[PDB]
Amino acid sequence: TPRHISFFNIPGHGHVNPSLGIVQELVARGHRVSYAITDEFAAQVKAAGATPVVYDSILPKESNPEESWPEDQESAMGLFLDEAVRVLPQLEDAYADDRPDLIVYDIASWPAPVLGRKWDIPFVQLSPTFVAYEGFEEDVPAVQDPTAEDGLVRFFTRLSAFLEEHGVDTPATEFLIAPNRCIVALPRTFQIKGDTVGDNYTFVGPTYGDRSHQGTWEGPGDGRPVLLIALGSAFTDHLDFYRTCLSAVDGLDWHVVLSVGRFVDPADLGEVPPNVEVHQWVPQLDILTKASAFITHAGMGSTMEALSNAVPMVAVPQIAEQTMNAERIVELGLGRHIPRDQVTAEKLREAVLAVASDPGVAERLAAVRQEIREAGGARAAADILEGILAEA
Ligand SMILES: CO[C@H]1C[C@H](O[C@H]2[C@H](C)[C@@H](O[C@@H]3O[C@H](C)C[C@H](N(C)C)[C@H]3O)[C@@H](C)C[C@]3(CO3)C(=O)[C@H](C)[C@@H](O)[C@@H](C)[C@@H](C)OC(=O)[C@@H]2C)O[C@@H](C)[C@@H]1O
Numbered sequence: 001t002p003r004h005i006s007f008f009n010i011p012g013h014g015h016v017n018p019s020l021g022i023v024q025e026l027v028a029r030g031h032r033v034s035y036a037i038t039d040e041f042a043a044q045v046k047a048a049g050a051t052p053v054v055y056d057s058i059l060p061k062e063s064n065p066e067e068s069w070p071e072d073q074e075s076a077m078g079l080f081l082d083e084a085v086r087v088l089p090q091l092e093d094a095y096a097d098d099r100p101d102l103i104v105y106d107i108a109s110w111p112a113p114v115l116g117r118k119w120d121i122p123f124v125q126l127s128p129t130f131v132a133y134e135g136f137e138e139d140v141p142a143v144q145d146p147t148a149e150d151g152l153v154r155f156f157t158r159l160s161a162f163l164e165e166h167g168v169d170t171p172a173t174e175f176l177i178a179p180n181r182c183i184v185a186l187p188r189t190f191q192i193k194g195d196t197v198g199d200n201y202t203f204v205g206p207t208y209g210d211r212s213h214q215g216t217w218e219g220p221g222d223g224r225p226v227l228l229i230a231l232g233s234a235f236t237d238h239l240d241f242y243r244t245c246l247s248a249v250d251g252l253d254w255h256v257v258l259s260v261g262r263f264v265d266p267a268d269l270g271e272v273p274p275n276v277e278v279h280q281w282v283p284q285l286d287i288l289t290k291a292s293a294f295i296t297h298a299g300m301g302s303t304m305e306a307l308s309n310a311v312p313m314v315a316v317p318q319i320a321e322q323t324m325n326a327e328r329i330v331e332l333g334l335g336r337h338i339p340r341d342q343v344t345a346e347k348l349r350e351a352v353l354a355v356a357s358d359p360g361v362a363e364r365l366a367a368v369r370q371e372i373r374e375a376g377g378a379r380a381a382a383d384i385l386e387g388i389l390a391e392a
């Protein structure tokens with residue numbers, strides 16, 4: 001019997017993209033899927049087969065170059081709280097006459113447990129990044145409730161007030177980091193201390209789907225190796241870095257696709273070498289199916305798309321989460337890590353050439369690609385959700 005499954009997410013490609021393979025699988029299985037997101041993402045969600053439930057957000061739009069995310073967790077958590085306050089009633093109104101049978105929610109979609117409780121329906125977290133392992137709060141002490149110093153006190157005070165007002169008695173830190181049930185969009189082997197993560201998490205590897213909505217990328221079709229350079233969907237405002245990349249690839253016998261993000265006008269790079277094409281935004285997944293190397297910020301989505309395609313990486317992280325991902329890449333022998341303020345043209349060139357030609361890296365990428373093929377993906381995730389629906 002078809003059920004109504006609602007996805008709650010936040011307006012960022014790194015949070016939305018992994019969910020879409022699960023949407024596509026659920027729709028294929030005959031379920032009615034609705035998807036709470038902003039207008040910016042409605043067309044993409046529609047293409048996946050879901051009905052958008054559009055809400056108004058105060059979060060920085062990845063399409064608006066006049067605003068950006070903060071780099072620090074403290075500020076970001078404040079933003080997600082204020083957004084939760086404002087989004088909660090919008091979703092309650094939208095679903096008033098048509099409550100879902102189950103909610104699948106992103107790590108930052110804090111209205112979900114509130115409404116799951118209110119509506120007495122199951123709610124399952126979908127994590128696009130690594131989850132809390134044994135001792136997590138010591139490594140990431142911003143999640144510890146102290147009740148920048150004043151800022152964290154103010155945040156926890158306000159978070160506790162929100163939760164209590166809306167009938168959630170879960171202690172604040174637990175609310176933030178310990179979901180009752182979570183489907184994780186990476187394999188356990190990549191997860192930091194994955195062996196210490198308990199059975200309320202299931203690691204299914206990347207869950208991205210058919211991204212035909214983005215269309216195809218047409219390569220030169222000359223047999224030359226293709227390098228993708230892309231720093232994700234958020235922390236991309238790095239003109240000097242992109243100029244350094246141009247110098248790095250000049251005279252390289254490779255085709256290069258350079259994605260510069262929404263903050264940088266491609267014309268501000270000037271004349272680019274003849275082997276380079278520059279865009280603000282590219283069909284990254286399609287290009288990664290054709291690529292021989294990838295200069296990446298090591299966001300989890302980008303990491304998992306590359307690994308699914310056995311593409312070696314040179315990681316230049318922006319925020320701490322990405323540094324942790326880059327360290328895992330190094331530890332697993334899948335690429336190189338060059339910290340942001342240690343980048344030069346020569347270093348980038350040497351790294352790309354080294355990772356793309358290393359037979360040991362190639363062997364390890366082949367192994368990891370197979371692990372991902374075995375992890376279960378969107379099929380396993382949909383199975384888990386259907387098991388919950390069978391009871392609910
Ligand atoms: C290890 O250091 C990390 C720790 C933490 O990295 C986060 C995450 C990924 C950040 O999101 C990112 O925030 C930046 C600002 C924008 C970005 N994009 C939308 C563009 C977004 O994905 C958070 C702020 C989002 C958030 C609200 O759910 C939380 O803070 C919660 C309570 C969170 O701690 C738990 C679920 C634990 C188990 O997960 C994590 O610690 C991940 C790894 O915050 C990062 C800023 C630090 O770099």
Ligand SMILES: O=c1ccn([C@@H]2O[C@H](COP(=O)(O)OP(=O)(O)O)[C@@H](O)[C@H]2O)c(=O)[nH]1
Pocket residue numbers: 012013014015017230231232233234235259280281282283284285298299300301302303305
């Ligand atoms: O030009 C681009 C740049 C990024 N992406 C997609 O945006 C997502 C970025 O997510 P990630 O987790 O790597 O990083 P974040 O944007 O969260 O920092 C991935 O799915 C990419 O395929 C894309 O399609 N085209």
